[PDB]
C-alpha cells in the first residue's frame, strides 16, 4: 500500500495543509456565525 521510502516529505506537507485549512475555515465560520447571531436578533424584533 502506502509508499515504501520517503512519503514523509510529502506527508509533512499534507499534514501542514490539513492543519492550516482547519484553522482558516474555522475563522471563516467564526465570522459567519458571529454576524448571523446579531442578524437573528434583528429579525425577531
Amino acid at each position: 500500500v502506502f509508499p515504501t521510502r520517503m512519503t514523509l516529505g510529502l506527508m509533512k506537507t499534507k499534514l501542514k495543509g490539513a492543519n492550516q485549512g482547519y484553522s482558516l475555515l474555522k475563522r471563516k465560520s467564526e465570522a459567519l456565525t458571529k454576524r448571523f447571531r446579531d442578524i437573528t436578533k434583528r429579525i425577531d424584533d
Binding site: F2, T7, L25
Partner: protein
Amino acid sequence: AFIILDEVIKVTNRRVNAIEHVIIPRTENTIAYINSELDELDREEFYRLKK
C-alpha cells in the same frame, strides 16, 4: 441575505469537522508507519554490514 447565510453556515460547518475527523488522523497513521519502515532500513543496513 439572512437565508443565503443560513445555507452557507451549514456548508462551512461540515468542512471544519471533515478536515478534523477524517483527514488529520489518516495523515498521522500514514506518516508513522512509513517513518518506522524508513528508519528500519537505515538501521538494519548497518547491522547486516557490521555482522
